[PDB]
Amino acid sequence: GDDRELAILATAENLLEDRPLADISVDDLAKGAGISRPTFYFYFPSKEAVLLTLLDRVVNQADMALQTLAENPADTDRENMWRTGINVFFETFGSHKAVTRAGQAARATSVEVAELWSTFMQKWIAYTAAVIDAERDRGAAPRTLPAHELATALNLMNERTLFASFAGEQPSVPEARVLDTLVHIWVTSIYGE
Amino acid sequence: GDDRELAILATAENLLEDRPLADISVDDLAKGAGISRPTFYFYFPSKEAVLLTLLDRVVNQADMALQTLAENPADTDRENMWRTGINVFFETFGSHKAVTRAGQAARATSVEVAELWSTFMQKWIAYTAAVIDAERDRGAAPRTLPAHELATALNLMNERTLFASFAGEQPSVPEARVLDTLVHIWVTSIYGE
Ligand SMILES: O=C(COc1cccc(F)c1)Nc1nc(-c2ccccn2)cs1
Numbered sequence: 001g002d003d004r005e006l007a008i009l010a011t012a013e014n015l016l017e018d019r020p021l022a023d024i025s026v027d028d029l030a031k032g033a034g035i036s037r038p039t040f041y042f043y044f045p046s047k048e049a050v051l052l053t054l055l056d057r058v059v060n061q062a063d064m065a066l067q068t069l070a071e072n073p074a075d076t077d078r079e080n081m082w083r084t085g086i087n088v089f090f091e092t093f094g095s096h097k098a099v100t101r102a103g104q105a106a107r108a109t110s111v112e113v114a115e116l117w118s119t120f121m122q123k124w125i126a127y128t129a130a131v132i133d134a135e136r137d138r139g140a141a142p143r144t145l146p147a148h149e150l151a152t153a154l155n156l157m158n159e160r161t162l163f164a165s166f167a168g169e170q171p172s173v174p175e176a177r178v179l180d181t182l183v184h185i186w187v188t189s190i191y192g193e
Numbered sequence: 194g195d196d197r198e199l200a201i202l203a204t205a206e207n208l209l210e211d212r213p214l215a216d217i218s219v220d221d222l223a224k225g226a227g228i229s230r231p232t233f234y235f236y237f238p239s240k241e242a243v244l245l246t247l248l249d250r251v252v253n254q255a256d257m258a259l260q261t262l263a264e265n266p267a268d269t270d271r272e273n274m275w276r277t278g279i280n281v282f283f284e285t286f287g288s289h290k291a292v293t294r295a296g297q298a299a300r301a302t303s304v305e306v307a308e309l310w311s312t313f314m315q316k317w318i319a320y321t322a323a324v325i326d327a328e329r330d331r332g333a334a335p336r337t338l339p340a341h342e343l344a345t346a347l348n349l350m351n352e353r354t355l356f357a358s359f360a361g362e363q364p365s366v367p368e369a370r371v372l373d374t375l376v377h378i379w380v381t382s383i384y385g386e
């Protein structure tokens with residue numbers, strides 16, 4: 001049952017590594033999953049729904065990793081605290097580059113994809129802002145910008161910069177440099193007066 | 194001659210304020226410009242070429258404004274120096290929100306739009322990096338990140354954050370707060386040690 005669902009998802013993720021969603025047919029997904037086209041439609045109403053499910057899995061993987069980190073703070077300096085958190089997104093989305101790029105494209109055409117991305121970005125920004133606020137309350141960070149506005153810009157920077165790096169866009173930060181680049185900008189803007 | 198070309202461009206910019214490019218027909222552009230459909234095709238091969246021309250005009254407007262500022266440095270502090278430069282993009286793209294949003298969408302489907310955007314982003318990043326380097330050479334900024342990598346991330350942050358604000362995305366920084374937000378992040382990350 002879900003084995004055929006997982007087979008469809010794995011086929012789609014593998015096919016997206018070499019071609020975009022518009023060049024993959026339902027017949028391609030069914031054939032790769034070892035089922036017929038009508039059997040595919042039992043599990044998913046469309047190839048777009050397959051991508052939505054793939055992206056939901058990736059974003060919830062990142063969310064759960066961040067939740068785990070929040071409950072188990074690593075015992076290091078403040079810079080490496082932010083690095084460990086940004087690295088959740090670097091590693092999670094960087095391990096699913098094809099789904100990440102396909103999902104970014106689908107945001108312009110899928111209301112469900114756009115709402116999924118917006119929901120989680122709001123959650124992650126609210127968490128960033130709450131950590132900034134806690135740092136200000138304990139006297140470690142200065143009260144400069146409104147924390148939620150700062151958190152919004154830093155999270156949008158990460159979205160755009162990580163995704164440019166993973167896609168090899170021109171221009172982009174090399175993937176092997178992008179974590180250090182983002183960590184520098186986060187730490188200086190959160191703690192700088 | 195170019196009056197009919199300008200009329201086509203003005204019609205397209207006005208129509209894009211209420212509907213996306215996929216819901217505007219060549220007949221719509223011709224009718225609004227007071228010409229027939231074949232006469233339209235004398236001036237532009239497609240509605241996509243009309244948008245490409247509109248975006249080229251906007252990006253060159255921003256580029257020329259930045260060039261003007263580079264040749265005529267305002268006499269203020271370092272923070273207001275960066276603010277005046279970021280404000281070129283805030284004001285130029287914020288005065289053409291409909292073309293900006295349509296051009297961003299077209300990047301996924303138009304090679305010419307993607308190459309136009311990439312060309313100018315490379316130019317603006319190289320200028321940012323050169324100013325950072327000059328600030329380091331005179332002892333005003335510390336030698337932290339590679340200047341070009343820092344410049345890349347800051348310019349991608351501005352692209353994503355300004356465009357989210359102009360589009361009213363959820364999440365986004367309010368348009369009335371986004372210049373101050375970006376200036377803070379630029380100044381702290383360029384001058385912070
Ligand atoms: O890039 C991020 C999230 O932004 C995104 C979102 C989607 C895609 C993407 F590529 C990046 N960083 C974050 N870090 C924290 C953090 C909180 C406490 C301690 C350490 N880090 C919280 S959100």
Ligand SMILES: O=C(COc1cccc(F)c1)Nc1nc(-c2ccccn2)cs1
Pocket residue numbers: 274275276277278279282283286314317318320321324348349351352353355356
């Ligand atoms: O947002 C920017 C350019 O990035 C973009 C690019 C496209 C669209 C968009 F919305 C933003 N800021 C820049 N500022 C400078 C600057 C150089 C010296 C002194 C002061 N400013 C140089 S590029």
